[PDB]
Amino acid sequence: TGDKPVDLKEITSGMFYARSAGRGIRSMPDGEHYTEMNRERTAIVRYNYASGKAVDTLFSIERARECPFKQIQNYEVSSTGHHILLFTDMESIYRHSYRAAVYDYDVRRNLVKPLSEHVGKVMIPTFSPDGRMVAFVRDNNIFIKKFDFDTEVQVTTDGQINSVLNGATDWVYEEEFGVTNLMSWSADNAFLAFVRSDESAVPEYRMPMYEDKLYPEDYTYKYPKAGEKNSTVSLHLYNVADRNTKSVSLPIDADGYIPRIAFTDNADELAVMTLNRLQNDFKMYYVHPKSLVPKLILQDMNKRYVDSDWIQALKFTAGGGFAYVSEKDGFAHIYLYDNKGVMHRRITSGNWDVTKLYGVDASGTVFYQSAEESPIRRAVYAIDAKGRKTKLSLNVGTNDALFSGNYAYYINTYSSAATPTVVSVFRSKGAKELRTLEDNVALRERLKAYRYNPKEFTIIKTQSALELNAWIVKPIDFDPSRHYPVLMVQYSGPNSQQVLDRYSFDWEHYLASKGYVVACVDGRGTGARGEEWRKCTYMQLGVFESDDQIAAATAIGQLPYVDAARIGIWGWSYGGYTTLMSLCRGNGTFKAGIAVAPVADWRFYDSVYTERFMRTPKENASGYKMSSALDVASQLQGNLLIVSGSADDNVHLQNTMLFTEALVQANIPFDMAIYMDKNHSIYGGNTRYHLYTRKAKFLFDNL
Helix, strand or coil, rough: CEEEEECCCHHHHCCCCCCCCCCCECCCCCCCCEEEEEECCEEEEEEEECCEEEEEEEEEEECCCCCCCCCCCEEEEEECCCCEEEEEEEEEEECCEEEEEEEEEEEECCCEEEEECCCEEEEEEEECCCCEEEEEEEECCCEEECCCCEEECCCCCCCCCCCCCECCCCHHHHHHHCCCCCECCCCCEEEEEEEECCCCCCEEEEEEEECCCCCEEEEEEEECCCCCCEEEHHHHHCCCCCCCEEEEEECCCCCCCCEEEHHHHHHHHEEEECCCCCCCEEEEEEEECCCCEEEEEEEEECCCHHHHHHHHHCCEEECCCCEEEECCCCCCCEEEECCCCCCEEEECCCCCCCEEEEECCCCCEEEEEECCCCCEEEEEEEEECCCCCCCCCCCCCEEEEECCCCCCCCCCCCCCCCCCCEEEEEEECCCCCEEEEEEEEEHHHHHHHEEECCCCCEEEECCCCEEEEEEEEEECCCCCCCCEEEECCCCCCCCCCCCCCCCCCCCCHHCCCCCEEEECCCCCCCCCHHHHHCCCCCCCCCHHHHHHHHHHHHHCCCCCCCEEEEEEEEEEHHHHHHHHHHHHHHHCCEEEEECCCCCHHHHHHHHHHHHHHHHCCCCCCHHHHHCCCHHHHHHCCCCCEEEECCCCCCCHHHHHHHHHHHHHHHHCCCEEEEEECCCCCCCCCCHHHHHHHHHHHHHHHHH
């Protein structure tokens, strides 16, 4: 009911963005405390879970000796608190990876030192279990800093940029398997295991970079497109005492993946997660670090594919069994195993998906997140060893938790479509809310000040007889007797969702203030509706997703307050692709579309992602053909705005360049924008505001 008009620059400036836990919360091994940087990132503070008191400041800029910087950006505390790593001068590499200036704060001496007496940014510094050593990556080699002897030992010598990586991971493993760190220490501190990724034979992509250069310079990196050579991976154990390395022979294929390794809490068990190239056979081995003998411990085979996020999220139990989420039975559910691989208790059941696995406490209580309430929502649950399930979340919407070491407490983040983040601390027994760390008063008051309509959730019924979760924001002085344009907003990728009872305040409300209905529909292929719903697209991406947006548009179009001749579609990345597909396959259903950094053809996208859902080009020529937007470009109808960054390392500019040329040769008019030196997130300075303005204006002129 507020007074102020929603302004596009305010959206784009983050004025509506909720304050979150973002900054740095980490549970301590004692289980009763967590650490967190203060607001100014000038100190690291230790907090009691139960009381929330700041027990002490573990490190500060003010007090520390010989501290050359005024702020930190990240930290890590050693298991004993004798050493704290401090990270400054962070440089992002890709989505997750970064390098940094890393210092060792010697707690006992109140002294800041360099981690290494070699000046140079490093990656992935990882304490040994005893806190006394730090393995880190520099220049693609592994080093171990040893605090007891004030010495650094060099573990590998063959590291080489764009060729050989030790511990760190290649572009595609980082992006698609979610793994930046393939090093792991034994529980007794005797071994550092690592994966060596050989990227030498993987093809390169080159991106011309233009800023402030007389001659352009290429950002060059290895990127395997669908069906091309991936890194070859090898597993090694370095024995700290002997300063010698051994290789592990794994009984897997030469084009397989090792997306994770991790020593368990037994010093004798190196867990190695492997996946074949088709990604339908997940096998985990335990390797004994002295005999080097691998033993198969878990195997998960799927008709279509095993989802590697569940490989990354597999949780070991104190007492070396583990909890694993498998889609075996048609939904994502938790299974509990001993250290011999014996599956002794299935934990969850029913027609709904587990969405996150937190862990298993000392009483065998299993803690997780699921969409049991609705595909649209997320709640945290506990299932104890007698099979009793308690929903721990107190509010309905989206809940996600970070548990203390013992799982006796957790920091919960809650939001709903209507309500921005409430970060509050709970005691697990009795699901008792202790206090609230943040509940965004200010943003709530700002919201009340503005005129906007709420997201109204519902289902879109298609002629094909699907029911698609959806939201709708009506225009500002909504008059049922009028005929409004609709913008359909979507992403549509495998297992993704845009229709979520979760807080978000984006340009939908700007457009709503200018007379547009905005709708968001999650079609086939999307998450939290079970395996079949998400994998029915297998080997034929985009077909069903297009069909469904076209079908959803067709139905929305029959609403009396909607002008069927003015329905548009917007999407970014897979959403961009889905836009192209929908304009190409909908026989003029959409009047306009915006396609931001779209894949044009799955041939152009990367190995691990594309093949998961499509297999290789050689094996699926029909699928790749059916799924190509580029192939059907000459069928495009409606007004298109297509946009890309010039330096997009994820969805290559190539996609957009090629699609536009198809349009040109078919005499199809369209708008395009290429943002210089920008990547897949198209931002920097005024870039987002300029882009969203462009997009809004394009809709005002064409929709």
